[PDB]
Ligand binder design. Sequence first.
Ligand SMILES: CC[C@H](/C=C(/C)[C@@H]1C[C@@H](OC)C[C@H](O)C(C)(C)[C@@]2(O)O[C@@H](C[C@@H](OC)[C@H](O)C(=O)O1)C[C@@H](OC)[C@H]2O)CO
Ligand SMILES: Nc1nc2c(ncn2[C@@H]2O[C@H](COP(=O)(O)OP(=O)(O)OP(=O)(O)O)[C@@H](O)[C@H]2O)c(=O)[nH]1
Ligand SMILES: Nc1nc2c(ncn2[C@@H]2O[C@H](COP(=O)(O)OP(=O)(O)O)[C@@H](O)[C@H]2O)c(=O)[nH]1
Ligand SMILES: [Mg+2]
Lengths: 128, 431, 431
Amino acid sequence: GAAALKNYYEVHKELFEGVQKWEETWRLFLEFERKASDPNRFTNRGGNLLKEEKQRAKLQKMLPKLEEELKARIELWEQEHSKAFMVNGQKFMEYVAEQWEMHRLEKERAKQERQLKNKKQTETEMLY
Amino acid sequence: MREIVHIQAGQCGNQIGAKFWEVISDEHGIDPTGSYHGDSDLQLERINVYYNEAAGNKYVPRAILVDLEPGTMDSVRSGPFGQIFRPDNFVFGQSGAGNNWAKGHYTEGAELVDSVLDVVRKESESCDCLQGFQLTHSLGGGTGSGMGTLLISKIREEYPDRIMNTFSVVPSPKVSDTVVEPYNATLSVHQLVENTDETYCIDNEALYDICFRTLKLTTPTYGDLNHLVSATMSGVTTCLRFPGQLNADLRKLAVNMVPFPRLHFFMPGFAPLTSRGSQQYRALTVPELTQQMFDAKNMMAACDPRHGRYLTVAAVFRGRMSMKEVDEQMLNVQNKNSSYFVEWIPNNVKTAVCDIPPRGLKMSATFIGNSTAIQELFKRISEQFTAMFRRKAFLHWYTGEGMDEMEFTEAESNMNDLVSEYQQYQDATAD
Amino acid sequence: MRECISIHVGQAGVQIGNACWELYCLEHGIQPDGQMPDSFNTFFSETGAGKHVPRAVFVDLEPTVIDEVRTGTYRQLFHPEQLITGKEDAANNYARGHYTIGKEIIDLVLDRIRKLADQCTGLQGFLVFHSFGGGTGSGFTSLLMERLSVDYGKKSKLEFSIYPAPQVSTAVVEPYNSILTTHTTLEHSDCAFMVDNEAIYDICRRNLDIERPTYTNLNRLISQIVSSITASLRFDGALNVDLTEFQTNLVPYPRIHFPLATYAPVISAEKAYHEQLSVAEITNACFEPANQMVKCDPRHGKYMACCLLYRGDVVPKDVNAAIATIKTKRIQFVDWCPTGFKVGINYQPPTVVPGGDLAKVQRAVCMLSNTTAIAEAWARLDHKFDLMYAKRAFVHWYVGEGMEEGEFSEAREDMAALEKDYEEVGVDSVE
Ligand SMILES: CC[C@H](/C=C(/C)[C@@H]1C[C@@H](OC)C[C@H](O)C(C)(C)[C@@]2(O)O[C@@H](C[C@@H](OC)[C@H](O)C(=O)O1)C[C@@H](OC)[C@H]2O)CO
Ligand SMILES: Nc1nc2c(ncn2[C@@H]2O[C@H](COP(=O)(O)OP(=O)(O)OP(=O)(O)O)[C@@H](O)[C@H]2O)c(=O)[nH]1
Ligand SMILES: Nc1nc2c(ncn2[C@@H]2O[C@H](COP(=O)(O)OP(=O)(O)O)[C@@H](O)[C@H]2O)c(=O)[nH]1
Ligand SMILES: [Mg+2]
């Protein structure tokens, strides 16, 4: 009935939109990852660095909280409905992991890239 | 070797500097004529740090003296060591600025500075490795603050990678000896913060207390007060001038004392300060020294560190002593009084040891504390500042010099944020 | 012939070197003028006049230190170009030591080293002396090792280092510099020897029964350890141990290579007269926590590998007996090891330096020890780092020198892994 449709809708608010909330939190997280690169912030006229640190820690906790919630909400959904909970060709929990690893691997890669550049710089100087 | 340029600015600055150079010359065996008559090869060996061996055996302290008007620098030249200085390093105008910061940093100073810097450049050119600059100036002084501030900015412009430090004389919490202090001081700080790498705060008020108490003096003449200050200054750079066990380069001090740019204000201290009437009832041990160094009553800045925490402390020792004594003793301090140190930083103490004692003091030490209690000073200033500012008190003496009122509001903004910063870190915790 | 190149970096590295070479000369009868009024060709080269020239390179961005050497007693023992100096030090800033300052010197250094290496008939390896925390020691060495390993990928890379002791001071930005160095050290060093100044003080107090020690005798103790190691090359023994064998007999897993060190029997003549320092006696002393040169109570972990170096009047069978007893002492060893004892014996007894504070003995034992207990120290270090890094204290000093903020993260990450490694080793492998 309509009530059941609304029930899974509320689940989706805690699940489907819950993922969107995770993604929004995730986006913000990425914004902190970006902002962190601006060395000018060391001149923290307003105590900015302390403020930033608090927020960084907060997000580090939030992303896990939301993921654990979603693990239960997606289970509820798939128990309440046969349709696999996926969108745009990927399961929502896979999507969570996808972006996570996207960032992870990219960050790791970029690090390694620069490591290599340093190794090549070192080589160059030895050749010089 | 590495070289330091000593700039003196304002009546105060020059008077202090005069005493400073007296002290330094004494330590290196340099007489009033600039002739070397030292005993140790060390005195001469690294003399380059300050003096420029002109010719023959005549050494010329590389110092620059600046004032907006004569009658100050003149008296310096008439003094015992006036002739030790090279005439061409006396740069001054023919106009005053009765504690008119605006004049010092604008309508008058803007003219004088055009010279000054040229001399600075020449002096820096004669250096092999320009360590940095030292500025002796007094806050609130039309020259000291006005020109002082100006010069600092101008120098960084051309020497951004050098260490700049100053020994400012700050406002007194008690009776003010100027009327428009708050203004001048605030205006100076507004820019000072964003320039100078580290600066020391010394307050005549505190010095008087020390003299009347610890030194058992009854006639604390400014010359004596300056002498005390000079001693502190010389201690700071002993590591450059002399060999030791743990030499601490001026730059190094900055590194272990400043955790965040902007937060670079320090409270200086010095030991031993025992009065001659009681020197015979002393032991002069590493413990004794630390007792004095961490005694709030021996703070040369008029603040009470007891109400704050130390972000970091530097301790520079001179003469002879064991490494064991020093390290262990400093540890004891942190352990016994851990509540006075900021938990964010493990090991809040930096130490250094030079093997060359002050003349007559087998053991001596200087104390540089980065305490959050300094906030107090700035707080006081801001409060007094707004009290006057909101009444537009005497602003016409600044507005009339082409100063934009907005500059005052900006100055306040910086000041208040400075306070906030200290307040945040004051009680910020690891978890 | 077996040859070895010593490298001394920074205040500590150099100052320690002074003590070392002082000792080397004594043991070989070499007089300050390089004169010898047959085992020298390891540390010394022969010049046209026969004069001995020690094989080492001294590097210190702070010319002061080297100047002490240049004007010291042993100024005649060094080929000028072995004393490489900078103009400005690293101010306890790894980034200066590695990226911005050391960068401009390292080329010279390596060239000098190469020329020295080219005098060799068979280089065994290098002995690098430095301190963690020292901008030069820490920062510069990092760079140095990075490049030495390229030219000499197969030479032994030994180093001695002062490990910022848990409860001491000296510098504030230590844990930063320390970790930053470690992070790179792990990829080039073959074996590092950890020494704590803190621990040594304790030893001076309890074993030597003295008070008020300085680097002038703290280093002397250290030099005894160094001698003990290289004595193997320099003198005939029952069981000579080439430097190469220290890898095999100490490291059991690449990333782990931080042996601790000790040295028995430290003692004043006062007690020497009242005590029979037998082989067994001494051997036991080496395993008494109190006598370790590192502030780490070995009982907290297990032993991975021990190496004993006996000097002087010892008897193989007695040594074996002593060790067997040690094995009995239910001192824990990891299951991964079934032996744990590699022993060298050198006929040349310990000597004694005129004016020293250590009694001469007929026999002595130097012990190197790889133990999981060290993990504690690493944890402490990492913890301190975390606290400072969180707020980003002093970080701007590194970033301003071109260091990448992420680089700190990287280093920390690796350190976490390192600690974990130790944990895994001590798992007590069992089906
Ligand atoms: C450690 C840094 C330091 C902070 C503190 C609290 C330190 C701790 C200790 O000194 C290291 C005190 C010290 O051990 C003493 C008791 C011998 C003593 O010196 O304390 C003071 C009063 C004390 O403040 C109460 C002092 O002013 C002070 O500053 O104390 C009276 C004095 O009369 C002879 C004597 O009784 C600030 O730099
Ligand atoms: N045992 C011993 N330790 C020393 C000596 N000199 C310095 N240290 C220790 O080394 C550390 C400081 O590093 P230093 O070697 O002084 O620094 P540096 O390598 O000269 O680097 P910068 O001065 O920063 O350029 C501290 O832990 C000191 O206690 C010494 O002669 N003997
Ligand atoms: N310690 C010390 N303070 C001084 C000396 N001369 C002036 N002052 C202080 O400096 C401030 C006045 O500034 P001053 O340098 O004379 O003015 P300026 O010439 O315009 O810079 C006041 O706080 C005075 O107490 C001195 O020789 N020693
Ligand atoms: Mg050094």
